[PDB]
Design a protein around this ligand. Sequence first.
Ligand code: CO
Ligand code: CO
Lengths: 360, 360
Amino acid sequence: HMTDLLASTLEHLETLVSFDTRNPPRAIAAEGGIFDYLRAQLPGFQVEVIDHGDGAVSLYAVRGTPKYLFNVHLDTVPDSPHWSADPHVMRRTEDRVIGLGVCDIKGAAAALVAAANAGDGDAAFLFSSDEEANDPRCIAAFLARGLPYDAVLVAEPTMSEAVLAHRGISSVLMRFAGRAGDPAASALHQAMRWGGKALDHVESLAHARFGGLTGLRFNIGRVDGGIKANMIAPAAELRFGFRPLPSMDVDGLLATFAGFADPAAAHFEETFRGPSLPSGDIARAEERRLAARDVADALDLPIGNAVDFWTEASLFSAGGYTALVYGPGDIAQAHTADEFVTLAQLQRYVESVNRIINGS
Amino acid sequence: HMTDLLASTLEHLETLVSFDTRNPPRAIAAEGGIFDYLRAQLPGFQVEVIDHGDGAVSLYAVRGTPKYLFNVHLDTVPDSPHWSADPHVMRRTEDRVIGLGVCDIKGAAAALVAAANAGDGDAAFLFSSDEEANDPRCIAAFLARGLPYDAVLVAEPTMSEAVLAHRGISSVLMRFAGRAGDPAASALHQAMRWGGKALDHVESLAHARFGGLTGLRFNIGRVDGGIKANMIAPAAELRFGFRPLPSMDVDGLLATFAGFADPAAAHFEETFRGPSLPSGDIARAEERRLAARDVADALDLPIGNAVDFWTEASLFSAGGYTALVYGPGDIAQAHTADEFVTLAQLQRYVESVNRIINGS
Ligand SMILES: [Co+2]
Ligand SMILES: [Co+2]
């Protein structure tokens, strides 16, 4: 099954995918490349490209006097391991397309561009390029401009359903150092004791709940230290993260985790922190969530369940905007070899945003 | 202070050190090199060189009808990191010599060769080349010959004191694999829980004692797994070891450690196991220890305290020989950058073995 709108989405997507926007290394320039392309695909829009430096670039486009803002990040995660073909050459099958970023989240960008070219309805787009890694600058810079919008829809794969809430996120780098001057002699033994305490604590929060989400997702994703079995390891590196539910005290959680290290870790560095969606006290979280639900209803979008993954909708929400996450595709395909998004998902999403933008 | 005996020891040591006998890679041949050298430095000895393959070579030399056997391994640990000069070029200061293996344990070999060349007293030497790493073959092969000896003195740095007992040793390689089908999803979380149980168990054995040695020395020397902080790690490698006191049930300990993994570790491989010295039931251990003490007294050697490190004296003892560890130098310098042994230690040791071999 094909439609002109879907055909156009696929054409734009093929081009978008061909642009290397992997982050890291986030070698994205304001001039040339993907942004020069988008500049020529937004008829009737007032367009501005802002270079925030080091690959953090934004394209803000406005046509008419839209009440809603669509934000879509253009960077993708790195490719491989195991891609069966060039990640930057979109492939197509009977029911889906394959390519780096087709699911997260260039598919949404392609659909929005298709809609922009299928009618001249009011619309506002904010294409950023730094969502996938550290040192983000785009959204923070945009928020500082204080531009009014009734709501902001941030694109991420949500199976084309409006998501109103999601967990926050924290990533931490820890380094343990042996104390020759002793049960703390080994950095690995220290890491082991720390880990036990951390996991036990996570278990104690298992009953916390929010919109179907339960407990605290916690993960020790990397441990590296030592040389040989019987040689005492003087150093050990450990990286962990957790995804708080809205209203959880993240500052307190981080300090609690840090305090489990005895002696103190030689290094304890939170490399990234993202707020939950919505964020704040439970009362604020529910009020904000309901405001987002009302917007989804107004735009006739099916409401999906809260998700565990993080998105920048959290930033807009913390900034005072009613915000929701909405995009084609399944998060299951995000950051996977031969990443794909179904034509069905692409069609549903493009028809929806075209309706919002150009529909009667 | 200098003596002809010490001067000769130093000359032989300089040569011995110059031969590369690092293990790994244990690139030691029966022909040429260090063994061809020893063949020409043992006057009056019946000499045999046996190639056991892959760098495991032995030189068995006998002069007269000696009652004691001196075993000295000729391989050394690998060099660096941080050596300030060529590890194979022995350096000398006012009170010590520096070089790979001068302390562990070529210094003893040099002294024994010096003694062999300072008199024609009865003596038996067994120079092996595979003590420092896995896949040993020399001692096992020698034991299979069933050659009688009242006692076997195995060289290791013992500050020139006769050591009568030491811990056994075990090294294990573990691999944890995440169970997607779940609290066991992460291999690192599994390793963390395993480690906690293992350390707790070690603590429960803290009161075990033997000749001044207390508890079970246990060590998780290497942990490596995962990629990023928030990505679930499907695999994790862990290497640990422990050093049992004589009479401890090592088989039981190993199974206990293995059982702490829930689910079972994807891989649990004991890469090396060495018996304690002496070994067996407590009664046997004490009887054997006393027999070794009597030999030390007979040879007028000062008795040192039991040690934590492992030696092949354990193998001879398990084979039915009264055995003790005896050698110049401090274990503190073993396997260190700019490894050294004092002239004082060299002098004391060479004078002692010369006395045993050639003395009235
Ligand atoms: Co995304
Ligand atoms: Co040694």
